[PDB]
Design a protein around this ligand. Structure first.
Ligand SMILES: CCCCCCCCCCCCCCCCCC(=O)OC[C@H](COP(=O)([O-])OCC(O)COP(=O)([O-])OC[C@@H](COC(=O)CCCCCCCCCCCCCCCCC)OC(=O)CCCCCCCCCCCCCCCCC)OC(=O)CCCCCCCCCCCCCCCCC
Ligand SMILES: CCCCCCCCCCCCCCCCCC(=O)OC[C@H](COP(=O)([O-])OCC(O)COP(=O)([O-])OC[C@@H](COC(=O)CCCCCCCCCCCCCCCCC)OC(=O)CCCCCCCCCCCCCCCCC)OC(=O)CCCCCCCCCCCCCCCCC
Ligand SMILES: CCCCCCCCCCCCCCCCCC(=O)OC[C@H](COP(=O)([O-])OCC(O)COP(=O)([O-])OC[C@@H](COC(=O)CCCCCCCCCCCCCCCCC)OC(=O)CCCCCCCCCCCCCCCCC)OC(=O)CCCCCCCCCCCCCCCCC
Ligand SMILES: CCCCCCCCCCCCCCCCCC(=O)OC[C@H](COP(=O)([O-])OCC(O)COP(=O)([O-])OC[C@@H](COC(=O)CCCCCCCCCCCCCCCCC)OC(=O)CCCCCCCCCCCCCCCCC)OC(=O)CCCCCCCCCCCCCCCCC
Ligand SMILES: CCCCCCCC/C=C\CCCCCCCC(=O)OC[C@H](COP(=O)(O)OCCN)OC(=O)CCCCCCC/C=C\CCCCCCCC
Ligand SMILES: CCCCCCCCCCCCCCCCCC(=O)OC[C@H](COP(=O)(O)OCCN)OC(=O)CCCCCCCCCCCCCCCCC
Ligand SMILES: *P(=O)(O)OCC(C)(C)[C@H](O)C(=O)NCCC(=O)NCCSC(=O)CCCCCCCCCCCCC
Lengths: 128, 174, 104, 459, 125, 67, 87, 63, 178, 110
């Protein structure tokens, strides 16, 4: 029939085409009810604080605080030297350095060879 | 004008063709030039005349500093700090003067190209040769001294160049 | 957040987030000003194939047109004084190799 | 130089003897007067330096740094009086005393004529900075930040002390003039390699060099506003000044020993710009921008050409002013909402118009926008690096693109969009804050008008 | 655009001319007495008129006359039709001369092909 | 002038805008026709394109094959 | 820029559209008539009515809110509140 | 009156200041203002020296 | 936007949303009114053809196939109202929306420029402050012990009360503020 | 609700001023500038008329394809139509892939 749509990581699967959207178990309905209950509880708390007339300031967001903490200060305590981390770190932190070193050293060696052989167009190169 | 030296900053004689109109139509450029002279040039000339009259009542003069020559780093003994200081200061002043010489030649080149316009490739060959020679000499003198350049480093470079020239001459004569 | 629902009454309408809900680790890159992962009318693989095919075909045809150029049934243009020897910066002292153009 | 040193040592007793409510007024007024007096040092000679005495001398490289330090002191006073309202009188006076001591040490550091006196002063600058950070910082991480800053700097600088005393024993003098006139080439040997390494590594840690830079985010994020202003504006310039001074005696070994540092600086410039792209904290974003710009300055000093040194000096001055302004703006936002997260407060353009204008101007200068001195310095460094090699242009172009990206991203995130609904304590901007931003920004444009004053001795 | 491209690409490139190498035959090959082209405008005249180097071809005198006519009657920018037509006609004549050169090259090439084929046939037989 | 909104009806127009639009369209067409009348060579060409096949081998300087 | 809306104008326009609907008898159509209890339409008809109102007033009604607009008075109130009409 | 005040200020004062600056300050150092030299055609009268640049030779006129 | 969402969309809600989306995209394809009316009538004919279906499994499968057909045949660039989320005029006036808490930080001279507005503003503030305790009491009386199971709020059950959590809904910025 | 109104003197005058240039400015500008390029006086007639012929062909083909939109016929879009309407898929891929990879390496790696 119609050509199928293949989702990617940068073009995800639409909800209307998700197979799980048309196969609803009774437990799925109670999961959705629990999710709505959690959202409603959080919404009620935020709205009460928001509409409080005596509140002056910023409603601190525990979720935002957890996010900013986990992004920076929680990374090193939870890092372990593994083969994957070691290889990725060595690659991403050493390979570019030596690649650029090889490129620049080769270029400058060729330039110096031309300078010594005296066949490089260096006229008008007054500023250096 | 007497503001600058015509020999240092040459300008070819200006050949402006005489107007030869062929139509009875009025010239808007001529009319607008007359308007510009009447409205702008006369008031600015009067203002400058007043300013120059006020200047002539308070005429005072300023002078150009002259530095007598001093022995150079070749004459200075090894680790003779005072002679080295005098020679280094003299070399720095000479470096500045040479830079301004190159600047003057470059200004000549630019002005000549603009003046010649569409025939610059042929009519600016005279100024291109002078610039080539001056830039070549300046580059050989001060090409790769570095950020911490000094009279000693320039002298060492000159010694290296002289040794190379002597070796080349000997090889050619061989 | 682009994939998130635009008609819901979010606590933060611009970011499309609610107060207190867990925040995705990569929220800094999934905001509406940045990387978008919303579904497209055409599959990603199909889009990549079509774009790559178009650009590769255009490059190939540019090279083919370069090796098979287009011109007119005319000979070279002729210039009076040794193909304008002096006008193009030639040396007045040296004598150029003469270039002569004949009537036809 | 005593006409500038003594008024600071008189700022000390005046601050300690003034009334409890006149301390800020007196300190600000007399700091501004001292800055005006120090403006007279910009009249330099074309041949040599200004040799005041056997102890202090001034050059075209020292003069703008001194002017920047003296001008930076009153701005730090204004920010401090913003955030130290409830402090006791004695602690306010101690804070002002630490700032005054830091300024005095910096002045004598930039004007010292011997390498050993320069070392002593530039190591003495650590104590007031450490006390300020670890005492008046806000958060818990100020202690760890102080430890990192202190031990990085000292581990860098101790081999420098050993190398300096060794060089004095070898040559007879550490006076900068003598070692410039009596300089001799450095042979390619392991001993010379390690002397080169000792000196350069001290100043590279002070710069900082990429891979030796973690103390910079740690200290700049966790220091009070005055500490952040002085750390980025001036204290990062001690490494550049030292490298521009000591490399007289390290030739021709610098031609061969500069490869690892050049590669580190270029790649780390790219890496820190990319890090700035994905930062959840505003102060961290500004700190990593500082790291990127100082990496560019390191590249300039290492390639070591007359066009690179002018670019290095211009970029140092421009970065000092711009980073100070950015830190002040971030601190005003923090004082509004008591948090450093970038996405917590938005719509600040529709809530605070003139602050949005200041943010726009500061962010425009943070990226190289012509004809600002930031662009002048960056362009000179890029041109010298191009003459050095022709792929440095690739790296510099990538860095410029990412710099524009993260600067405008910070501006768009903080200022544009819709305001956060629950943040209802954003009072209108104070005349003090607006005046602080104006005093940061106007001198930068004046320097753009007159650019030969900050291009160094090589001009 | 044209049939010559079709003949050269989907045909005998040896018989069709090469624009980048033309001419490949001596100018006097087939012409007993051939006259060199006459240049009216001198180098000094063209240099003073500041004609662009592309405009300093054999039709330069008409261009100089057109420029002088345009400068003199400035407000009336429609009073140089005769000079413009003269310059255009000289350019047209130069273009047809170039076309004649191309055609001569083409038929000389095909005559050379016929001659060499005849020589090969004679050598074989 | 104030133009009242119309609901489900053609909007109210003005004699001024009507005459102006007509005048400018007529101006464009008059200009095109007037320029085509005077200088039509800019569209249809001015000089004939020669036919190379009609050029004689004598005037192209081609010798006979045997010669 | 455009003239401001009024409650009477909104009511007139919604009733105009509903009277131009064929499935609705114009005589028995009042501002309190229910689309299904006393007009005899169904879900698809209500969807079409909402779409017609969207086309009429030039703005979109979200599906979460449009499902509940079961009366011309409800439509008038919703549009007035969304467009900030108080008179 | 408004247009008269606008014209004198906004146009007259800047043109006065700029003409004064150019005539007496900018055109006092060499090569600051460089004019492309005028085009000289055959049969012309150079006004500086009263010189007569001669006409071109007789064209081989066609039609 | 003004209605609290539910936990899930029923089959009727799903099919009605699909019907509206298909009608909008069909209108995008069929630009002209007569053509759109013809094809919209045909589309509603298909929906009415499948309208009566007792088998919920078959109805869900029909919905799934219809959704796949829609995704294949959707307009790549459908018409969006200017003020709608995808529209060109979307969020244009968000920079002009200023809140009343920002209003109360005015200088006394600025406040004196509008003597009558701020009297009514003070009246509104008094009304808000006199009702918050009753609002919170009403909210906590009617909530289940477990917590709010939905995002809907109750009305004012008493003669002198206001609906709980009303201030920001009532005082939200106008759609064209400046 | 028809709010169509274009009787503002500002709008009319600005469009009038830019409308005179779209008719006459080309003639004046081309006839007043000096000749800075050699004209192509001689060329085949079909090459002289190439621009007009292709313009007229585009006019006719586009007009016919637009007239076919009135028919009571419905057909799903083609692959070529999708490629043309969606900007050649360039903004999608080139604005989602490189940005995602750069922003991912900016945090995961650096
Ligand atoms: C300035 C700008 C920035 C600059 C750059 C800065 C950043 C980059 C530089 C720093 C990079 C990281 C630091 C170096 C590596 C440190 C690793 C470490 O400390 O690990 C401790 C950490 C803790 O030890 P553990 O708790 O006993 O083991 C836990 C493991 O999860 C359980 O282990 P396992 O049993 O799963 O291990 C299996 C396998 C895991 O290893 C691998 O999978 C790596 C595969 C390649 C290894 C090398 C191949 C060639 C080996 C033979 C060479 C012969 C030469 C003659 O082991 C091996 O392959 C055997 C050992 C191989 C040599 C290790 C030498 C050390 O152990 C590991 O991470 C295990 C792997 C260690 C080696 C990984 C590869 C290192 C590559 C280095 C390249 C340079
Ligand atoms: C580990 C893999 C590795 O060698 O990475 C080098 C690489 C340097 O970049 P590169 O472009 O590969 O170096 C250019 C040539 O390979 C090497 O350049 P070259 O062969 O033209 O000759 C110059 C060479 C002359 O060779 C020597 O002097 C070698 C003799 C021993 C040197 C010991 C250096 C001690 C002082 C530094 C201590 C901290 C490190 O200079 C050095 O070795 C400079 C030593 C200091 C390097 C950078 C120090 C700061 C690191 C910051 C990140 C730390 C995490 O990365 C690092 O050094 C940092 C990451 C590893 C630690
Ligand atoms: C210097 C002025 C510094 C002003 C700082 C802020 C002052 C303030 O509070 O203003 C609010 C105040 C009243 O505003 P409000 O509505 O009451 O307040 C609500 C908002 O704050 C109203 O906010 P707003 O958005 O209306 O803000 C107005 C203005 C405020 O923002 C700015 O003024 C930004 C200016 C700094 C840009 C930083 C990056 C570039 C660095 C260039 C450095 C050049 C130095 C030259 C010498 C400067 C000496 C001070 O922002 C903009 O115009 C947007 C940025 C546009 C930047 C365009 C730069 C293009 C390159 C220009 C190069 C020119 C020099 C080379 C020429 C070579 C060939 C001859 O406005 C003023 O007092 C107007 C001041 C002038 C504004 C325009 C500046 C134009 C800059 C030159 C452009 C080239 C044309 C020549 C113009 C000659 C005059
Ligand atoms: C990897 C390939 C790389 C290729 C690189 C080179 C690219 C060259 C492009 C050539 C031009 C393509 C034109 C069409 C593209 C857009 C198609 C589209 O969707 O349009 C809908 C769009 C209508 O949009 P809409 O109102 O939203 O309606 C939606 C449709 O109803 C929705 O209905 P729909 O979806 O059925 O509508 C599209 C349909 C209807 O459109 C057409 O039929 C357009 C036909 C245009 C004219 C073609 C023939 C020209 C004949 C000229 C004869 C005289 C020559 C000169 C010499 C005369 C004296 C001897 O078109 C087709 O089915 C194909 C048309 C031709 C495609 C050419 C490219 C081929 C790509 C690779 C092969 C793909 C094959 C499979 C297709 C996909 C799978 C099914 O069309 C237009 O607005 C106008 C269309 C074009 C009008 C101008 C045509 C003339 C100018 C171009 C041709 C050259 C003339 C001569 C120039 C001078 C030479 C010296
Ligand atoms: C663990 C491995 C640690 C390696 C890094 C080195 C740091 C530990 C320092 C210990 C000294 C090791 C190097 C010794 C070099 C040395 O002594 O010789 C230098 C030379 C000796 O010459 P002579 O003895 O007179 O020989 C006469 C020949 N006829 O003396 C000098 O030039 C002065 C040099 C001072 C010593 C410098 C040692 C440090 C070198 C750089 C390391 C500092 C990096 C800073 C750390 C920051 C980043 C972590
Ligand atoms: C329509 C599709 C056309 C496909 C054409 C494919 C390429 C044809 C080709 O290879 O022609 C041979 C030669 C050019 O080939 P070349 O550029 O050397 O590369 C060969 C490596 N594949 O080309 C030739 O030998 C012909 C050169 C013609 C030059 C014309 C004047 C310039
Ligand atoms: P009202 O409350 O009466 O609503 C009646 C409903 C529909 C709720 C029924 O009570 C009902 O649920 N009936 C059983 C289920 C059912 O009818 N399902 C039908 C849904 S899909 C169907 O069969 C019709 C879909 C066909 C059209 C698909 C659209 C594809 C083309 C789109 C192209 C977009 C651009 C042209």
């Amino acid at each position: 029939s119609f050509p199928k749509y293949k989702p990617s990581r940068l073009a995800t699967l639409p909800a209307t085409l998700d197979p799980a959207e048309y196969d609803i178990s009774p437990e799925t309905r109670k999961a959705q009810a629990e999710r709505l209950a959690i959202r409603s509880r959080l919404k009620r708390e935020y709205l009460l604080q928001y509409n409080d007339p005596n509140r002056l300031g910023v409603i601190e967001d525990p979720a935002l605080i957890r996010w900013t903490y986990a992004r920076s200060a929680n990374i090193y305590p939870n890092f372990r030297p593994t083969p994957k981390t070691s290889l990725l770190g060595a690659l991403f932190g050493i390979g570019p350095l030596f690649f650029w070193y090889y490129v620049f050293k080769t270029d400058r060696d060729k330039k110096e060879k031309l300078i010594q052989e005296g066949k490089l167009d260096q006229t008008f190169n007054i500023s250096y | 004008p007497d503001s600058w030296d015509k020999d240092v900053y040459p300008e070819p004689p200006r050949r402006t063709p005489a107007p030869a109109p062929q139509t009875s139509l009025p010239n808007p450029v001529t009319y607008l030039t007359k308007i510009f002279d009447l409205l702008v040039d006369r008031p600015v000339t009067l203002a400058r005349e007043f300013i120059e009259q006020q200047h002539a009542k308070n005429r005072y003069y300023y002078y150009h500093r002259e530095f007598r020559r001093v022995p150079d780093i070749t004459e200075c003994e090894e680790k003779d700090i005072l002679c080295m200081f005098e020679a280094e200061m003299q070399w720095r002043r000479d470096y500045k003067v040479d830079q301004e010489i190159v600047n003057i030649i470059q200004e000549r080149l630019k002005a000549c190209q603009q003046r010649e316009g569409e025939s610059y490739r042929q009519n600016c060959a005279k100024e291109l040769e002078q610039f080539t020679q001056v830039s070549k000499a300046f580059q050989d003198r001060y090409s790769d001294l570095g950020a911490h350049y000094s009279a000693r480093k320039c002298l060492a470079k000159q010694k290296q160049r002289m040794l190379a020239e002597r070796k080349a001459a000997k090889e050619a004569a061989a | 957040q682009q994939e998130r629902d635009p008609w819901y009454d979010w606590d933060h309408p611009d970011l499309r987030l609610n107060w207190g809900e867990p925040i995705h680790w990569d929220l800094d890159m999934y905001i509406r000003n940045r990387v978008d992962t919303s579904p497209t009318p055409v599959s990603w693989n199909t889009m990549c194939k079509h774009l790559f095919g178009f650009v590769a075909f255009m490059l190939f045809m540019f090279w083919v047109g370069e090796i098979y150029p287009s011109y007119q049934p005319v000979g070279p243009k002729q210039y009076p004084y040794n193909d304008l020897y002096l006008e193009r910066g030639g040396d007045p002292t040296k004598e150029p190799e003469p270039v002569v153009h004949y009537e036809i | 130089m005593l006409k500038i040193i003594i008024p600071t040592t008189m700022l000390l007793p005046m601050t300690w003897m003034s009334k409890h409510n006149m301390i800020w007024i007196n300190a600000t007024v007399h700091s501004l007067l001292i800055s005006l007096i120090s403006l007279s040092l910009l009249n330099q000679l074309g041949e040599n330096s200004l040799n005041f005495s056997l102890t202090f001398f001034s050059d075209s490289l020292s003069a703008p740094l001194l002017v920047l330090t003296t001008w930076l002191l009153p701005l730090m006073l204004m920010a401090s009086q913003s955030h130290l309202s409830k402090e006791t009188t004695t602690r306010k006076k101690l804070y002002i005393t630490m700032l005054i001591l830091l300024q005095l040490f910096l002045i004598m550091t930039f004007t010292a004529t011997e390498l050993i006196l320069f070392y002593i002063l530039f190591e003495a600058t650590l104590v007031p900075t450490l006390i300020i950070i670890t005492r008046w910082g806000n958060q818990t991480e100020r202690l760890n930040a102080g430890l990192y800053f202190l031990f990085y700097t000292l581990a860098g600088s101790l081999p420098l002390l050993v190398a300096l005393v060794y060089i004095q024993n070898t040559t007879g003098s550490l006076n900068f003039l003598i070692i410039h006139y009596w300089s001799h080439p450095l042979s390619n040997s392991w001993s010379n390699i390690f002397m080169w390494l000792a000196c350069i590594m001290a100043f590279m840690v002070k710069m900082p060099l990429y891979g030796l830079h973690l103390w910079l985010p740690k200290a700049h994020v966790e220091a009070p506003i005055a500490g952040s202003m002085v750390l980025a504006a001036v204290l990062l310039k001690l490494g550049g000044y030292g490298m521009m001074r000591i490399t007289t005696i390290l030739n021709p070994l610098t031609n061969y020993m500069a490869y690892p540092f050049l590669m580190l600086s270029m790649w780390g410039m790219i890496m820190t710009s990319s890090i700035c792209l994905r930062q959840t904290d505003l102060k961290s974003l500004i700190a990593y921008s500082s790291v990127s710009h100082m990496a560019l300055v390191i590249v300039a000093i290492m390639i070591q050409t007359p066009w690179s040194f002018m670019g290095a000096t211009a970029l140092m001055i421009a970065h000092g002013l711009t980073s100070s302004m950015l830190f002040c703006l971030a601190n005003t936002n923090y004082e509004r909402v008591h948090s450093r997260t970038m996405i917590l407060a938005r719509g600040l353009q529709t809530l605070l118009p003139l602050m949005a204008t200041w943010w726009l101007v500061a962010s425009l200068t943070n990226l190289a926008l012509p004809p600002s001195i930031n662009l002048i310095g960056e362009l000179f460094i890029i041109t010298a690096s191009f003459s050095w090699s022709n792929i440095t242009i690739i790296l510099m172009g990538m860095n410029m693109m990412i710099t524009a990206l993260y600067s405008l991203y910070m501006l768009i995130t903080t200022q544009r969009g819709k305001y956060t609904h629950h943040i209802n304590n954003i009072k209108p901007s104070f005349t003090r804050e607006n005046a602080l931003m104006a005093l940061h920004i106007l001198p930068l444009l004046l320097l753009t008008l007159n650019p030969k004053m900050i291009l160094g001795p090589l001009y | 655009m044209g049939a010559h491209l079709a003949r050269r690409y989907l045909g005998d490139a040896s018989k069709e001319p090469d624009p980048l190498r033309m001419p490949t035959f001596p100018p006097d090959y087939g012409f007993p007495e051939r006259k060199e082209r006459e240049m009216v405008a001198t180098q000094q005249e063209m240099n003073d008129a500041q004609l662009m180097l592309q405009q300093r071809d054999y039709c330069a005198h008409y261009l100089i006359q057109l420029l002088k006519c345009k400068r003199d009657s400035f407000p009336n920018f429609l009073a140089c039709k005769h000079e413009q037509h003269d310059w255009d006609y000289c350019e047209h004549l130069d273009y047809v001369k170039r076309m004649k050169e191309f055609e001569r090259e083409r038929r000389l090439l095909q005559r050379k092909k016929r001659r060499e084929q005849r020589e090969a046939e004679m050598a074989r037989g | 002038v104030h133009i009242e909104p119309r609901y489900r009806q053609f909007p109210q127009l003005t004699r001024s805008q009507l005459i102006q639009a007509e005048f400018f369209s007529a101006t464009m067409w008059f200009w095109i026709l007037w320029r085509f009348w005077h200088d039509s060579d800019a569209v249809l060409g001015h000089f004939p394109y020669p036919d190379p096949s009609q050029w004689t081998d004598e005037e192209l300087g081609i010798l006979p094959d045997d010669e | 820029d455009a003239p401001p809306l009024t409650l009477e104008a909104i009511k007139d326009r919604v009733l105009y559209v509903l009277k131009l609907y064929d499935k609705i008898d114009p005589e028995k159509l009042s501002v309190n008539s229910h689309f299904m209890k006393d007009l005899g339409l169904d879900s698809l008809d209500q969807v079409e009515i909402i779409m017609a109102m969207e086309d009429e007033f030039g703005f979109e009604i979200p599906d979460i809110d449009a499902e509940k607009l079961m009366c011309p008075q409800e439509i008038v109130d919703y549009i007035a509140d969304k467009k900030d009409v108080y008179e | 009156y408004r247009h008269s005040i606008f014209a004198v200020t906004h146009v007259l004062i800047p043109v006065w200041i700029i003409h004064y600056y150019l005539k007496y300050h900018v055109t006092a150092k060499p090569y600051t203002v460089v004019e492309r030299k005028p085009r000289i055609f055959p049969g012309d009268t150079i006004l500086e020296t009263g010189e007569v640049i001669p006409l071109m030779k007789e064209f081989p006129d066609q039609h | 936007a003004f209605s609290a969402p539910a936990a899930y969309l029923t089959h009727q809600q799903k099919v009605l949303r699909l019907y509206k989306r298909a009608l909008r995209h069909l209108e995008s394809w069929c630009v002209h009114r007569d053509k759109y009316r013809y094809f919209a009538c045909l589309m509603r004919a298909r929906f009415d053809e499948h309208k009566n279906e007792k088998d919920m499994v078959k109805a869900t499968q029909l919905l799934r196939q219809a959704e796949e057909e829609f995704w294949y045949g959707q307009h790549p660039q459908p018409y969006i109202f200017p003020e709608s989320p995808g529209g060109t005029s979307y969020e244009r006036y968000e920079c002009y929306k200023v809140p009343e808490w920002c209003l109360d930080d005015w200088h006394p001279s600025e406040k004196a420029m509008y003597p009558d507005y701020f009297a009514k503003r003070e009246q509104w503030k008094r009304l808000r402050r006199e009702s918050w305790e009753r609002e919170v009491k009403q909210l906590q009386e009617e909530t289940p012990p477990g917590g709010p199971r939905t995002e809907a709020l109750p009305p004012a059950r008493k003669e002198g009360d206001l609906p709980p959590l009303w201030w920001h809904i009532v005082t939200r910025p106008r759609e064209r503020p400046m | 609700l028809v709010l169509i109104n274009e009787n503002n003197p500002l709008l009319i005058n600005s469009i009038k001023r830019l409308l005179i240039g779209s008719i006459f400015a080309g003639f004046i500008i081309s006839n007043n500038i000096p000749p800075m390029t050699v004209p192509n006086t001689t060329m085949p007639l079909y090459m002289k008329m190439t621009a007009l012929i292709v313009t007229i062909m585009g006019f006719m083909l586009a007009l016919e394809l637009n007239n076919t939109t009135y028919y009571l016929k419905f057909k799903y879009p083609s692959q070529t139509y999708k490629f043309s309407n969606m900007l050649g898929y360039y903004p999608s891929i080139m604005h989602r892939l490189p940005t995602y990879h750069n922003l991912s390496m900016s945090q995961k790696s650096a």
